[PDB]
């Protein structure tokens, strides 16, 4: 779980992290609630990680990948948010793999 902290810190602070820092506001984003069944974002991961709530690095990785799965589901790949999401997804998978 020390690596989870390192990786979360790095994602929070990444230039491309802007769409993922806070939960999506469904009042402002038409269709979000309908389309995305299990919302996830880095602030929600951070709350769970500090309150003690992950059992394994695998549960943490599952929430990270959920962020980027939702991103690809809702946003076109050539949209500003999609493009950011690809950078972030690749960053996560890269860092996660060079540690595990
Ligand atoms: Mg997957």
Author numbering: 1799 to 1898
Task: Quote the authors verbatim.
To gain insight into the recognition of acetylation marks by the NoRC complex, we solved crystal structures of the TIP5 BRD in its free form and in complex with a H4K16acK20ac histone peptide and two cocrystal structures of BAZ2B BRD bound to H3K14ac and H4K8acK12ac peptides. The crystal structures of free-state TIP5 BRD as well as in complex with H4K16acK20ac were solved at 1.76 and 1.65 Å resolution, respectively. Interestingly, both TIP5 and BAZ2B BRD contain the aromatic “WPF shelf” at the ZA loop shared with BRD families such as the BET family. However, in the BAZ BRDs, these three aromatic residues adopt a closer conformation compared with the more open form of BET BRDs that creates a wider binding site sufficient to accommodate two acetyl-lysine side chains in BET (Morinière et al., 2009; Filippakopoulos et al., 2012). On the other hand, it has been shown that the tandem PHD finger-BRD modules of human TIP5 represent an independent unit that interacts with H4K16ac and triggers the cascade of events that establish the repressed state of rDNA. Zhou and coworkers reported that inactive TIP5 BRD mutant at the conserved tyrosine does not repress Pol I transcription and suggested that interaction of the BRD with acetylated histone H4 is a key event in NoRC-mediated gene silencing. Isothermal titration calorimetry (ITC) data suggest a preference of the TIP5 BRD for K16ac.
